Scaffold this active site. Structure first.
Site, short mmCIF file in Angstrom:
data_model
loop_
_atom_site.label_atom_id
_atom_site.label_comp_id
_atom_site.label_asym_id
_atom_site.label_seq_id
_atom_site.Cartn_x
_atom_site.Cartn_y
_atom_site.Cartn_z
N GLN B 172 -4.60 5.71 10.26
CA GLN B 172 -5.43 6.75 9.61
C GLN B 172 -5.74 7.85 10.67
O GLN B 172 -5.72 9.02 10.48
CB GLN B 172 -6.65 6.19 9.43
CG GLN B 172 -7.46 6.94 8.63
CD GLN B 172 -8.94 6.42 8.12
OE1 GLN B 172 -9.41 5.37 8.61
NE2 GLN B 172 -9.63 6.79 6.87
N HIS B 176 -3.80 11.83 10.52
CA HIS B 176 -5.09 12.87 10.10
C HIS B 176 -4.89 14.08 11.17
O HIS B 176 -5.58 15.06 10.85
CB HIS B 176 -6.11 12.18 10.20
CG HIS B 176 -6.81 11.68 8.89
ND1 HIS B 176 -6.80 10.63 8.44
CD2 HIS B 176 -7.64 12.55 7.87
CE1 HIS B 176 -7.31 10.66 7.25
NE2 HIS B 176 -7.77 11.80 6.77
N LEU B 353 2.62 9.54 -0.21
CA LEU B 353 3.05 8.36 0.01
C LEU B 353 2.28 7.69 1.12
O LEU B 353 2.31 6.24 1.14
CB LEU B 353 4.54 8.28 0.12
CG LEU B 353 5.23 8.70 1.46
CD1 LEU B 353 5.29 7.86 2.89
CD2 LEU B 353 6.61 9.30 1.28
N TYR B 354 1.74 8.35 1.99
CA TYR B 354 1.03 7.66 3.14
C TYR B 354 -0.43 7.20 2.77
O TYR B 354 -1.02 6.71 3.75
CB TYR B 354 0.87 8.71 4.18
CG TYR B 354 1.41 8.30 5.58
CD1 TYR B 354 0.40 7.04 6.30
CD2 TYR B 354 2.55 8.43 6.00
CE1 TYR B 354 1.08 6.57 7.41
CE2 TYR B 354 2.96 7.86 7.27
CZ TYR B 354 2.19 6.96 7.99
OH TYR B 354 2.52 6.47 9.11
N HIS B 357 -4.38 2.98 1.03
CA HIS B 357 -5.53 2.43 0.61
C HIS B 357 -5.72 0.91 0.68
O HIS B 357 -6.49 0.24 1.22
CB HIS B 357 -6.06 2.90 -0.55
CG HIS B 357 -6.09 4.44 -0.92
ND1 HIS B 357 -5.56 4.95 -1.74
CD2 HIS B 357 -6.48 5.34 -0.01
CE1 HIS B 357 -5.76 6.39 -1.55
NE2 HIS B 357 -6.20 6.65 -0.59
N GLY B 495 9.64 7.41 3.50
CA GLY B 495 8.85 7.44 4.43
C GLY B 495 9.67 7.73 5.89
O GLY B 495 9.01 8.77 6.76
N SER B 499 9.14 10.95 8.32
CA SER B 499 8.42 10.54 9.72
C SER B 499 9.32 11.08 11.11
O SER B 499 8.73 11.36 11.94
CB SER B 499 8.12 8.99 9.67
OG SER B 499 7.73 8.39 11.05
#
Ligand SMILES: *[C@@H]1O[C@H](CO)[C@@H](O[C@@H]2O[C@H](CO)[C@@H](O)[C@H](O)[C@H]2NC(C)=O)[C@H](O)[C@H]1NC(C)=O
Ligand SMILES: *[C@@H]1O[C@H](CO)[C@@H](O[C@@H]2O[C@H](CO)[C@@H](O)[C@H](O)[C@H]2NC(C)=O)[C@H](O)[C@H]1NC(C)=O
Ligand SMILES: CCCCCCCCO[C@@H]1O[C@H](CO)[C@@H](O)[C@H](O)[C@H]1O
Ligand SMILES: CCCCCCCCO[C@@H]1O[C@H](CO)[C@@H](O)[C@H](O)[C@H]1O
Ligand SMILES: CCCCCCCCO[C@@H]1O[C@H](CO)[C@@H](O)[C@H](O)[C@H]1O
Ligand SMILES: *[C@@H]1O[C@H](CO)[C@@H](O)[C@H](O)[C@H]1NC(C)=O
Ligand SMILES: *[C@@H]1O[C@H](CO)[C@@H](O)[C@H](O)[C@H]1NC(C)=O
Ligand SMILES: *[C@@H]1O[C@H](CO)[C@@H](O)[C@H](O)[C@H]1NC(C)=O
Ligand SMILES: *[C@@H]1O[C@H](CO)[C@@H](O)[C@H](O)[C@H]1NC(C)=O
Lengths: 552, 552
Positions: B172, B176, B353-354, B357, B495, B499
């Protein structure tokens, strides 16, 4: 105090302090090692003894016209040569960019902040004893003195390569899309966040300006019709800001992408040509795509004109000033199997070397009339009458000034020429010999070797005392020209890497962009790949007058 | 309406309307030709029969712990392998970038405007008969329905791959910095103009914010001492903009680079840890460079921390979720003889996709206590009460939830989950199978093949009706996981390219930046090249507690 002030690191090795009075050279990937990165590795010594000088390569390129005639007609050979000149010019440029006026070390601020012109060589640190680092006196010679003794024009010296006013105004118009100094912030700052060929000088830098300039019908740019001729819209009509003296009537306050293009009718001429060209391409694209809306027509047209620009710049403009018999070629595909970064950051030095003041004539000759600077500035009524028609015809005829060779800067723009010197010092540029080394050139050992003569050489030696103290910009305008060329060695060998990087570094040149569907299909692709300064004028100027960047 | 609505072009070919009801596919450099770019060339079918399925490669990487144990211990072999995973993942990404939420065709607006997220696949045109283009009903199934039936958590499904809360909070915190959605403009826009790993979540996005967070002494960030521990400064002290509910006391309004990190103690844990690391590197650099000033200490420390971050993200973070026995490696030099663009534009789909949750647990367990969501949010007094060391120890122990496999999104963040679905539709995402084809994956033939089970598949079939209408985001959270893995096939294959492009595209990885002198010498360089999540915690957390991204 800074132990790196003497620039002790050679061959593009990096200097770093390790104490209050001690330094270290990072020789990584230079081909050299040792304290100052001067002792060469094995492969390096092989390359150095095989790499021909730039003057030698220039000699080969500008002679043997018959041999180049065969080569130019052999597609695989032509492409092969154009590939090499592309790759070698490119590797001279740091990309992603490194330094700027406030950072003589790599930092994230210097990388991320797009408001800076990048820098090919770091600035001289503020705590250095002399402006050039450690050599010379505490103060550089009086810039007024330099300007008057070796730069100002006594009598007009015409370009032996025959550059005309079509070329000179094209140079001003084209480069003014990426030379947009933010005078509020300082000389080392730009307003051109695109940092390359995005045609913001036609479309505006911001979205708000662009939309004010747009017709929002058929992808077209707003325009007006005067005497049956198409011209840009007015400030009153579009509300876009333009720079104009207060005595200029509203009907002559033309609104274009670049706010400063109203000050020179030569600029406004090209602004008009390109405006007509964009709307022309809209008509073509609408014909091919009736199902397309205004927005897609506009965007695609813009992408096409970006292509035309790069095409014309390489194969007409850069071709002309190169003096090469080899036919330069715009072909993105040549880099697809090469290592190349599709990005650019415009360097401050590229701005500085492009101050081609001696290009300007003493008077601007349009048919019968010969206009002074005061008569010519902010005067678009000149443009209207003689026209797009006589402007092209007249500018094609009038010879421009030789840039190198010295003493050819017109007196009107002496303030501008002095500013170029003073701002270079303001931004703490390194010496001429430093930049020559930075671009794989042999340092000058005297002012006589630089000028190729004696009178101006003696003048400079009295002013600067040491050749390692000589500044870049004055040396560029006083340098010994190549045989019947407009430029000396230093201008070409610095300018070519910067230029081709800017041209080829554009995204439309990247493999994902360089395909027909990007430009509305085969027809739009064709407009790019068959572009020329002649066809640009032919399609958009009434009567299809002949044009060239050289005097007929 | 639009003839390109059914996405007729295969294998990354580009569709272009040639009339109101005719289309053309640009098959350039796809390896395929024909109307739809579906008939391959010779080399194409060779590669196709030679390239194994992603599951085959995944199998080889996640088996033979004894064989990889040897490969990993052989430098040249490991480098050779890592080079291959690097180059191949990277070639999947468009660079320079192309489409965004407003542009289904290449345009200069889409390229130059940094406020947009880019997009791996263009949006579905607005005039298309169905949300996915042509297939399915006029309306996608009710998002609340999709949410409650196959996404909401019944009972906590732990990640069999062992991911802990150190992992979840790192995920997270780290992401962010480039997932900074500007909700004022729309879900397709971003406030992270750096579009990558620039550590703006530590140093601030803008310059004036950075300066408010800076101590301007020894390159350090401002801080305060509570108890005897170092914590970020306050809003009162620094006057920076943070987001806090009105009841949070002034002495708890911590000020960090990212304006929202004050709302989650896990985020404030990492913010604190990285703040300490910056100031720690300042002490090291200052020891090495007593002659340097504040500015250069700050900038060099930021560059080093950018390096540490990428090093940790690849060799610990990505290493952990890959499940590979092969030891991934951060080494920019691997790409120096490869074609690679040192640039990046954050893709919308990468953001989408990231949203992991289901990683979130039912409660947050810190030594003695077990905190609910309401108790945990906005509550930094928990961090002060327990301290960094207890936080690290507790979160290292606590298991995180499985992301694929369906039905594992906690009810608290159900609002967020619904917005993910809702905003994907607003942004006009193409179907799941279109995204699978985009990334060289075989399309799923049924909901049962997607889920790997029967119950959820049946629910999905009654909702979407056609597998080719299945949406990307719910598909990712519901997809059949790899054996004992946290993710299904689509998550990994989508991903990894995004990435690694973000990680390796960073300018410090370029040959011009990747040298000791960039980071203040060999000592600064070693900090990057020896960084690990363990060493990060050991150096900056009292007692040097053990850590890892997986449950001990
Ligand atoms: C790029 O750098 C320039 C120069 O540091 C920044 O311009 C300064 O901005 C601050 C606001 O924080 C002003 O107080 C200064 O007066 C400005 N200086 C100049 C010379 O303009 C600019 O903000 C930076 N740009 C970005 C995007 O960070
Ligand atoms: C990037 O694109 C956005 C979207 O068009 C631009 O934001 C718009 O700006 C105009 C004014 O020029 C406003 O009227 C709109 O309301 C804005 N829309 C949104 C969604 O914010 C933005 O200006 C562009 N950025 C740049 C740097 O060109
Ligand atoms: C020999 C005729 C074809 C050669 C084309 C070379 C184009 C310009 O090539 C230049 O040569 C300079 C001198 O060697 C070098 O300093 C530059 O790196 C290189 O770009
Ligand atoms: C066999 C062990 C070494 C191979 C390492 C490959 C790491 C992941 O490799 C990936 O494989 C995928 C499946 O084919 C492809 O889609 C990707 O292009 C490729 O990057
Ligand atoms: C704590 C669970 C809250 C979300 C469930 C409410 C939506 C009900 O949904 C149903 O749940 C059943 C039980 O899981 C399933 O068997 C059904 O397939 C599903 O449709
Ligand atoms: C390196 O350069 C410095 C400054 O130019 C000079 O004083 C020194 O002698 C040089 N050392 C070597 C080994 O050339
Ligand atoms: C502008 O050009 C016109 C010719 O069209 C000339 O008569 C006039 O004097 C010029 N204006 C100025 C201010 O010199
Ligand atoms: C091409 O694709 C369209 C839409 O997917 C389809 O209707 C058409 O039959 C295809 N044509 C060929 C030759 O595959
Ligand atoms: C925050 O956590 C503390 C424990 O340190 C607890 O006493 C307090 O009630 C919590 N606040 C809220 C609003 O849950």
């Amino acid at each position: 105090a800074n132990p790196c002030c003497s620039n002790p690191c050679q061959n593009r090795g990096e200097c770093m302090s390790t104490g209050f009075d001690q330094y270290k050279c990072d020789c990584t990937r230079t081909g050299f090692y040792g304290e100052n990165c001067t002792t060469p590795e094995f492969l390096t010594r092989i390359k150095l003894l095989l790499k021909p000088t730039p003057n030698t390569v220039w000699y080969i390129l500008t002679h043997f016209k018959g041999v180049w005639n065969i080569v130019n007609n052999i597609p695989f050979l032509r492409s092969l040569i154009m590939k090499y000149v592309l790759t070698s010019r490119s590797y001279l440029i740091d990309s992603p960019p490194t330094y700027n006026v406030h950072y003589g070390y790599k930092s994230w601020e210097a990388f991320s902040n797009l408001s800076y012109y990048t820098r090919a060589l770091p600035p001289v640190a503020d705590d250095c004893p002399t402006p050039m680092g450690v050599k010379g006196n505490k103060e550089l010679p009086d810039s007024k003195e330099v300007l008057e003794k070796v730069l100002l024009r006594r009598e007009f010296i015409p370009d032996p390569q025959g550059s005309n006013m079509m070329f000179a105004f094209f140079a001003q118009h084209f480069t003014h899309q990426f030379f947009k100094t933010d005078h509020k912030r300082g000389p080392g700052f730009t307003r051109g966040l695109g940092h390359g060929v995005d045609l913001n000088h036609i479309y505006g830098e911001t979205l708000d300006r662009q939309h004010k300039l747009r017709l929002f019908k058929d992808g077209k740019l707003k325009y007006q019709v005067i005497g049956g001729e198409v011209y840009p819209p007015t400030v009153k009509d579009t509300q876009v800001e333009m720079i104009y003296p207060p005595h200029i009537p509203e009907n002559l306050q033309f609104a274009v992408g670049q706010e400063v293009f109203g000050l020179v009718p030569g600029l406004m001429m090209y602004a008009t040509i390109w405006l007509r060209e964009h709307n022309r391409v809209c008509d073509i694209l609408k014909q091919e795509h009736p199902e397309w809306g205004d927005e897609q027509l506009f965007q695609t047209s813009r992408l096409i004109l970006i292509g035309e620009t790069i095409k014309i710049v390489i194969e007409d403009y850069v071709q002309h000033l190169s003096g090469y018999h080899f036919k330069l070629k715009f072909d993105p595909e040549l880099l697809f199997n090469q290592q190349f970064q599709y990005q650019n950051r415009i360097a401050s030095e590229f701005n500085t070397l492009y101050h081609w003041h001696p290009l300007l004539p003493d008077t601007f000759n349009i048919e019968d009339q010969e206009y002074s600077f005061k008569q010519f500035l902010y005067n678009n009524s000149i443009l209207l009458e003689h026209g797009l028609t006589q402007f092209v015809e007249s500018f094609t005829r009038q010879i421009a000034g030789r840039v190198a060779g010295g003493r050819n800067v017109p007196i009107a723009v002496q303030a501008v020429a002095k500013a170029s010197i003073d701002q270079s010092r303001e931004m703490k540029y390194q010496s001429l010999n430093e930049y020559r080394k930075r671009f794989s050139l042999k340092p000058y050992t005297s002012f006589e070797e630089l000028t190729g003569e004696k009178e101006m050489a003696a003048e400079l030696k009295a002013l600067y005392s040491d050749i390692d103290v000589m500044e870049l910009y004055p040396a560029l305008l006083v340098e010994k020209p190549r045989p019947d060329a407009i430029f000396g060695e230093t201008m070409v060998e610095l300018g070519a890497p910067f230029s081709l990087k800017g041209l080829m570094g554009n995204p439309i040149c990247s493999p994902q962009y360089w395909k027909p569907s990007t430009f509305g299909g085969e027809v739009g692709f064709k407009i790019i790949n068959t572009a020329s300064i002649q066809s640009l004028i032919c399609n958009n100027v009434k009567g299809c007058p002949f044009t060239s960047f050289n005097v007929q």
